[PDB]
Amino acid sequence: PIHLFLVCFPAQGHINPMLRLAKRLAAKGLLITFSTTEHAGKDIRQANNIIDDQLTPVGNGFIRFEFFEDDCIEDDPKRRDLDFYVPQLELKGKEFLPETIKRHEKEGRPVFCFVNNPFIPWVCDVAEDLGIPCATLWIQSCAVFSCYYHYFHKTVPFPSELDPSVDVQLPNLPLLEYDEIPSFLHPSSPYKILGTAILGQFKNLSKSFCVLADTFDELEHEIIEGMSKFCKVKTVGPLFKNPKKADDCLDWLDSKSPGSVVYISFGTIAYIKQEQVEEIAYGLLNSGVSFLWVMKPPDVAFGYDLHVLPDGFMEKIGTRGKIVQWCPQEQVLAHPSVACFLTHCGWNSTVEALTSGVPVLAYPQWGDQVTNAKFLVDVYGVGVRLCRGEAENKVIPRDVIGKALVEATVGKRAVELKENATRWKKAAEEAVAEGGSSDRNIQDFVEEIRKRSG
Numbered sequence: 001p002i003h004l005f006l007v008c009f010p011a012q013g014h015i016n017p018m019l020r021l022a023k024r025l026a027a028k029g030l031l032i033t034f035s036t037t038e039h040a041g042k043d044i045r046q047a048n049n050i051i052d053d054q055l056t057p058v059g060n061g062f063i064r065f066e067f068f069e070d071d072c073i074e075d076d077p078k079r080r081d082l083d084f085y086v087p088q089l090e091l092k093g094k095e096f097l098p099e100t101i102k103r104h105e106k107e108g109r110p111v112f113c114f115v116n117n118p119f120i121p122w123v124c125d126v127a128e129d130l131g132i133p134c135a136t137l138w139i140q141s142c143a144v145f146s147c148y149y150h151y152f153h154k155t156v157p158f159p160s161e162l163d164p165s166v167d168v169q170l171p172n173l174p175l176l177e178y179d180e181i182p183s184f185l186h187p188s189s190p191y192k193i194l195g196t197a198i199l200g201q202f203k204n205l206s207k208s209f210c211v212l213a214d215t216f217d218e219l220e221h222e223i224i225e226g227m228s229k230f231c232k233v234k235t236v237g238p239l240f241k242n243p244k245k246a247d248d249c250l251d252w253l254d255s256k257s258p259g260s261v262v263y264i265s266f267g268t269i270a271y272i273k274q275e276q277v278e279e280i281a282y283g284l285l286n287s288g289v290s291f292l293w294v295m296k297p298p299d300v301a302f303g304y305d306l307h308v309l310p311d312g313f314m315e316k317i318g319t320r321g322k323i324v325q326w327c328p329q330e331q332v333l334a335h336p337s338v339a340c341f342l343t344h345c346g347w348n349s350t351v352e353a354l355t356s357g358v359p360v361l362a363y364p365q366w367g368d369q370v371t372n373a374k375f376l377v378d379v380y381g382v383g384v385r386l387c388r389g390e391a392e393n394k395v396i397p398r399d400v401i402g403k404a405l406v407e408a409t410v411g412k413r414a415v416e417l418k419e420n421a422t423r424w425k426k427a428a429e430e431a432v433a434e435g436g437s438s439d440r441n442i443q444d445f446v447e448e449i450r451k452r453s454g
């Protein structure tokens with residue numbers, strides 16, 4: 001009977017994790033409304049079989065969709081600029097939320113709690129107006145949440161224009177160099193606007209009684225407890241891992257020996273340099289390893305030149321190498337043929353790798369990738385560092401890539417990284433299981449929503 005209204009920023013990287021929160025919340029006997037703009041919601045309509053607000057059953061509960069217009073044309077280039085679209089969403093969101101809460105109370109299914117996104121903190125402003133509690137979903141590590149929080153509150157000195165190389169020492173965190181904090185917070189970063197977009201939620205954080213993070217207690221225990229006095233953070237992850245599809249990727253991996261395929265993926269946004277693609281190709285070619293390389297075409301908005309492989313690379317590479325543009329990463333990471341994972345250290349790939357027990361080769365670029373790569377190599381003990389990010393502006397040569405591919409496949413260090421990754425796999429799976437640390441936190445979340453209604 002409890003109805004929760006989830007609002008999400010219109011981006012793929014934001015919609016999919018919030019969808020996982022909807023599935024985990026609905027399974028507990030809850031009615032979950034997933035809300036975003038129409039231009040992003042239509043992707044969810046044709047992905048499944050929903051064209052209206054028909055109740056889709058998810059376990060003991062249901063999931064329905066509700067989309068509001070943003071007054072932009074179908075493929076408006078205006079949406080690509082956050083300086084306009086972030087206030088535009090606030091304009092169109094603040095006039096849609098109150099009229100649908102009053103109608104839901106009229107129809108007998110009133111909203112008990114709000115769950116929003118840091119990119120749309122106006123939901124917390126609206127939740128306070130209607131007297132409905134609000135919570136914020138955070139799809140980054142709590143260690144990164146601590147970084148943004150202490151940057152906004154100036155707890156310690158951070159890299160500034162005058163002092164850009166200073167270290168940052170935060171409680172319950174390792175010592176972070178200037179390029180190890182989230183790159184959007186560096187004064188020489190070209191994506192400061194993304195940092196300002198995340199920091200907008202910290203002007204509003206008091207209006208959310210708790211923050212839901214896509215992590216588990218065993219991974220960041222010291223960090224979650226350290227943020228308690230500043231913000232009640234509840235671990236509900238890994239959200240992708242079901243508590244209780246296929247492609248030609250899995251069919252190809254079925255033919256390879258266990259722990260012998262290198263998985264390469266750089267996410268959905270990051271596009272590395274052509275010269276670095278050349279060095280990675282020669283690295284895989286001369287090392288003699290088997291690999292599955294995801295070469296995702298970039299969005300046409302950027303004037304990116306398409307990545308070209310070396311002359312005759314895919315010919316010298318035999319049946320032991322597979323180029324694709326997309327693969328079910330969760331199913332590939334769980335395949336026994338995968339040895340390591342060359343990743344850009346996106347938080348979703350970071351959590352997916354740890355939950356799957358796959359050691360990684362850290363090649364971060366920007367954002368929280370440089371902070372995730374630090375914990376993967378120096379804290380979680382499952383990674384092999386390749387670079388320090390886009391600000392390093394260094395092409396990693398073939399021989400260094402070659403030495404790291406062999407370091408993560410054969411030798412004594414490979415067995416140590418695999419044993420640490422296996423131990424993190426048992427912790428992640430236990431957390432989302434019945435009675436685990438994350439599943440219990442989800443139960444405690446539904447409890448406080450029931451307690452706050454009266």
Ligand SMILES: O=c1ccn([C@@H]2O[C@H](COP(=O)(O)OP(=O)(O)O)[C@@H](O)[C@H]2O)c(=O)[nH]1
Pocket residue numbers: 013265266267268269270294325326327328329330345346347348349350352
């Ligand atoms: O071929 C691919 C590439 C990526 N992903 C998924 O895309 C997400 C990437 O998000 P992440 O936070 O790691 O990096 P981002 O792309 O957001 O920078 C993860 O859930 C991956 O499982 C996937 O399923 N197949």
